[PDB]
């Protein structure tokens, strides 16, 4: 019938910052020799190379880059062992989002940066910029940001909850429209952790 | 209250460029998108990209990814738009609009008067 | 590249008459960032119905908004002389927003 889907991982990550590349590595177990890549998103787009055959696994790295808006969105491999096509089925998505395009946000955290264990802390994402979404990374969640407050800023809160443990965060901001396009990163913010005396 | 008034009719020669402005009065000028169309005649609108002032950071088409510039001066609370390496294709009238929010997806509520641009040697 | 098709693209009504008009978009799209627009000659256009259904101010209750997905529609209960113009629909779903081609409104005699 239909040979198994390939895997699809990006290298170094999801996330790539505007004018960069990624690398998008497409193999299977299945003697596949010929992988085709698939973009849905603003400018829809198919790119084919040969696989390469290495200890029993077949794979191709694609080179997503210099990184433009048009090469973000949502990513598929396909795999195919006859030429002249029979494609598998499809690999997991990869949702390729291009950042670093518009003014970063500012991460705070209250009531700080350094509370004592059980003490609550939320992040609060700001920006003069009227961006619709907010997104939080500690080394990733999405909340809607809220109309003018003060300064005329749009903002979200990320509660961390009691049991955090703390990390180094980034926030990125976003809107509705393009969906990935992101902006540029926020300063990280490091939220320690220390026990109660 | 809120008002868009847009620059003059101007002609311009084949393979030069234009810049038209866009001017705008009783709102916070900073607070909100700036979009700019192109319409020719006896068609629909084309979206040609957008500018937050506050920030002067940009969105553009990428139809018009290198035929326009768009630009704000905050303390004349006017918006700029460039056209270069003209061509009688880029002759048509040109709009700027503010939308009803700050979010720059909602409805195009204010309109400007117009400008159009005649490309002709 | 949510293209917007508007049908027809030119009608005629007489006086009175019931109007309706349809805009189809390649794309789904969502219902509150599909906006019509009413533009008579030399004048900019005019925000009509906002959010599908929702009337913009100053726009006459004979007017009306309805549809999902992809197809959408623009309805006039009586028709009236000074509802003769060109409409226009316009997503602002995905970028970069995307208008439709038009449908010129004429009064039929």
């Known amino acids: 019938g239909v040979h198994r889907k390939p895997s699809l991982l990006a290298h170094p990550g999801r996330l790539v910052k505007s004018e960069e590349t990624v690398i998008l590595q497409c193999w299977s177990d299945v003697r596949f020799e010929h992988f085709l890549l698939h973009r849905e998103g603003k400018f829809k787009d198919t790119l084919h190379l040969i696989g390469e055959h290495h200890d029993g696994v077949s794979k191709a790295n694609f080179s997503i880059g210099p990184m433009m808006q048009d090469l973000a969105g949502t990513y598929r491999c396909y795999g195919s062992v006859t030429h002249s096509y029979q494609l598998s089925a499809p690999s997991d998505p990869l949702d390729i989002v291009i950042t670093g395009l518009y003014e970063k946000p500012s991460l705070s955290a209250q009531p700080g940066p350094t509370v004592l264990a059980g003490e609550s802390v939320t992040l609060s994402c700001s920006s003069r910029s009227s961006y619709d979404m907010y997104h939080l990374s500690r080394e990733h969640e999405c909340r809607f940001s809220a109309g003018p407050k003060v300064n005329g800023t749009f903002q979200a809160d990320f509660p961390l909850g009691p049991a955090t443990h703390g990390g180094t965060y980034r926030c990125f901001g976003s809107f509705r429209d393009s969906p990935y396009e992101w902006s540029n990163s926020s300063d990280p913010l490091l939220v320690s952790v220390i026990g109660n005396p | 209250e809120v008002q868009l008034q847009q620059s003059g009719t101007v002609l311009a020669r084949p393979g030069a460029s234009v810049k038209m402005s866009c001017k705008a009065s009783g709102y916070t000028f900073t607070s909100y998108w700036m979009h700019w169309m192109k319409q020719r005649p006896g068609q629909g609108l084309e979206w040609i990209g957008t500018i937050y002032p506050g920030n002067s950071d940009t969105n553009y088409n990428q139809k018009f990814k290198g035929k326009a510039k768009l630009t704000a001066v905050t303390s004349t609370n006017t918006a700029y738009m460039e056209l270069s390496s003209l061509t009688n294709e880029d002759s048509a009238v040109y709009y700027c609009?503010?939308?009803?929010?700050?979010?720059?997806?909602?409805?195009?509520?204010?309109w400007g008067q117009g400008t159009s641009v005649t490309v002709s040697s | 590249q949510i293209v917007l098709t508007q049908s027809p693209a030119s009608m005629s009504a007489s006086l009175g008459e019931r109007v309706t008009m349809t805009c189809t978009a390649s794309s789904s799209v969502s219902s509150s960032y599909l906006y019509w627009y009413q533009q008579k000659p030399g004048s900019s256009p005019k925000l009509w119905i906002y959010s599908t259904s929702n009337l913009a101010s100053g726009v006459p209750a004979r007017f009306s908004g309805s549809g999902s997905g992809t197809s959408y529609s623009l309805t006039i209960s009586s028709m009236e002389a000074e509802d003769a113009a060109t409409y226009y629909c316009?997503?602002?779903?995905?970028?970069?927003?995307?208008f439709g081609g038009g449908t010129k409104l004429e009064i039929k005699r």
């Open positions: 609009s503010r939308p009803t929010t700050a979010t720059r997806s909602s409805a195009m509520d204010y």
């Open positions: 316009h997503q602002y779903h995905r970028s970069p927003p995307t």
